[model samples]
Target: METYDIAIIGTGSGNSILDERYASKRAAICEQGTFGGTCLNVGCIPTKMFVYAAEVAKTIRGASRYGIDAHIDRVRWDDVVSRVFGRIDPIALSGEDYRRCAPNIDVYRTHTRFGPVQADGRYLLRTDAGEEFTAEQVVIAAGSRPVIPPAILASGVDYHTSDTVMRIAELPEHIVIVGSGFIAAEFAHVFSALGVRVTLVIRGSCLLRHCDDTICERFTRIASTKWELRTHRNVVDGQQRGSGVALRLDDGCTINADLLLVATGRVSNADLLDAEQAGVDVEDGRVIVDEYQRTSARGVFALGDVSSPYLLKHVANHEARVVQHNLLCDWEDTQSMIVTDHRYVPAAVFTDPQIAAVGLTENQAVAKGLDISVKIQDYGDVAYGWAMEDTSGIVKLITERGSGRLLGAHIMGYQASSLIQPLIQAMSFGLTAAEMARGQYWIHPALPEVVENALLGLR
Candidate 1:
């Protein structure tokens, strides 16, 4: 058995907490997988690397629409895969190496769980490797993993989740995706852009159904023209057909594909930690943490996907900072402890004609009974959008009826991910629509003009 002043249970955002602040203290870092956690190893970083390649191929193919006559002679799948992981794999290695070599850090490459609390008030932590430890403080930054439904597991047909799909040996002839969120939508763009026939099996009525209803309808319509969409369908059973697989749907319909990708959603790692055993609360598979990222038990904290509803990388990063500050502050100095600010959170979907949003949706505002006003700005009306000849894309802005304060902004189209940042900043700092528009000089004929025009329309 060993003892430490502090123990961090995950290496994702948890890694950020062990900076210069705790350099002199004894600390143990426990991780079950790669050092960089889900973002670097599987989730955001690697997926976006693949998505960027898909976007390049898509642009080349569609160049003729812009009168550029560009074409892709070939897509070297092996080379593309190699390039992304070749760069990422090394970073994961170096991160592990750095922690292992640090004088103050003890690296435990195993899954761990909470044991009984010692008489001294410290908690006992046991690792899968037959190791026992105790710590004065512990941070549970353990993240989430892709969820594979029970029906698919029982079918005895081989399928891939986000963690394993990108590294598959080769591209498929036709890929059948199950789910309707960003994961399914993104994979649809990747495989379809790379010349694979994609059949999307959505449990919902439309793709990205969680977004603004108008954006969802527009994206669903655009996706229908690109791939075979099977909305309101569930995969009931599966069979192996030669080298491919055939999926049987709940409605007596069958869909065939060379590869299967499951993107239903993710479940938090809090479920695996047995948090209830340690007197910490777990609701809906997430560990409950207070504003200061403190769990129910003293000297214990939780953050990231394990506690946050946002489940976004940026949100995780924000929580990590708050937890770090709280860890350093004395327990009695409650005034010095920082509380996490989640008033403004932003998200983006990396797909064709990407979607990005921050703040309330129109329906959410109406439900809240806020006196609200709305503006739907078509991209084709803007100078840059007109140059691109866009028609399906739009910027929907919602504001307060009395003060014209910006309530929420949802955008879909080219550069939607980048375009939504200004709105996010305005809302975070409490800027009204009128001030956000007239207070700044928007470059003429630029993409930001769309945002400018929308804010002006709000008044």
Candidate 2:
């Protein structure tokens, strides 16, 4: 077995390598899966690539509706999918190898399971490859796993999750996607635009309930029109029927489709590790850590989905940085400490109008019963709104009645992702409506001016 001053398991948020706190410090790192973790390999990067392609398909497909004659001669499904993976995987692999070869870093492409630690404070780690190692400080960013439905697995037909969906052999004639998150919306756009029918099943009245209600309502409205949406039906099982599959709903209803995807949610990958034996708190198959992300066990830490907080990759990466700093912070410096604030992390869904919200919702603000003021402006109300006939979009601002300390910003409109940047900054910097409207430039006749109007409306 090998040993070091610090050992980090998994590399998802392990990108928290910036602070030179660990500079020249020797450590052993164990990682069993691909580098850059799931966000790079299966989640954000690949999904966005397909979403971009899906957008192009929509533009070309919708051209005729605008009196422009465009023909999609063909879509080489194989080539489109292959090219995306080709560009992403190699770069991730190369970087992992680089870390492995670093003189001060001993990298193991193997996973670690906690074993007994000796009286000397060295942890015993068993690798998936049947190897062993020991360490003092262990960071367990074990990541997460996709929740799969058993009926599909029992039917003996191939099943796909967010992890394996991007690399399918060929596009199914129709794909039934289960889950109401952004993946369902994004995939609906991608596959439907590419001439494949998409049937999305959600277990809620509308998708993305955590986002601003107006945006959530608008996005739900749009998704209903574009895709075959099935909401309010909880899924019971999935079975292979003929060459396709049928999804059995809790209401005794079933959905037939050429492809089946299970996107319900993900559980902590730490469940596969020795967290409990190592004295780490385990809940719902996830590792629970403190504010500093130190496991219940001393000299050990976990982050990302494997930890109980939000599972968004970006949030996990940021928390990973906090863990890195807190773990390495001066042990005696009680007066000075670093922590991660997960509140106000902006998240969006890629449905038609898109859904973007940061900080608390109006309901949340009202429930707390703070002295709050709400300002709402529609995209179709501005000059640009008239040009695109934008009657469907809205921007809602929730802030202090007069202090303008922005409590939240929610948007459902074209370029929702792009517009949320300002809101993210506002919440990040504690900017008030007055501060934003009076200090910033709206550039009249542009899309962002709509947000400016919403802020100014607070006046």
On lDDT, the candidate that comes out on top is 1
Which residue pairs of candidate 2 clash?
A: 404-432
lDDT per residue as tens, model 2, 1-459: 566778777777865652466666777777787887888888888888888887787778768765789979888889988899999889787978777677778877877788877778777888888878777778888888887656446655656788887898788898988887767677777788888888888888987776767767777777788788888876677677887887788789878888877777777887788778877889878887766666788777778888846878778877787777777666445346566677678787665666777888888888988888888899988998887667788899988885769998888878988998988998888777788887967887888889888988885
Q: Write the per-residue lDDT of candidate 1 for residues 1-459, one digit (tens) a residue.
A: 788999998999999999887888989999988789989888888899889999999989889998899878988999989999999999999999988999889999999998988888998999999999999999999899889878899898989999999998789999999999889998898899998899999888999988888789989999999999988889999999878899999999888889999999998989888778877899899999888888888889888998999889999999999999999888667788999999988889998879999888999899999999899999999999889999888999999898778888999999999999999999988898988899989998899899999998874
Quote each prediction's TM-score: 0.98, 0.93
Worst 10 residues of 2 by lDDT: 328-337
Q: Give lDDT for model 2.
A: 0.79
lDDT score at residue 410, model 1, on the 0-100 scale: 95
lDDT against the true structure, per candidate, is: 0.90, 0.79
lDDT of 2 at 442: 80
RMSD (Cα, Å) of candidate 1?
Answer: 1.1
The alpha-carbon lDDT assigned to residue 300 of candidate 1 equals 91
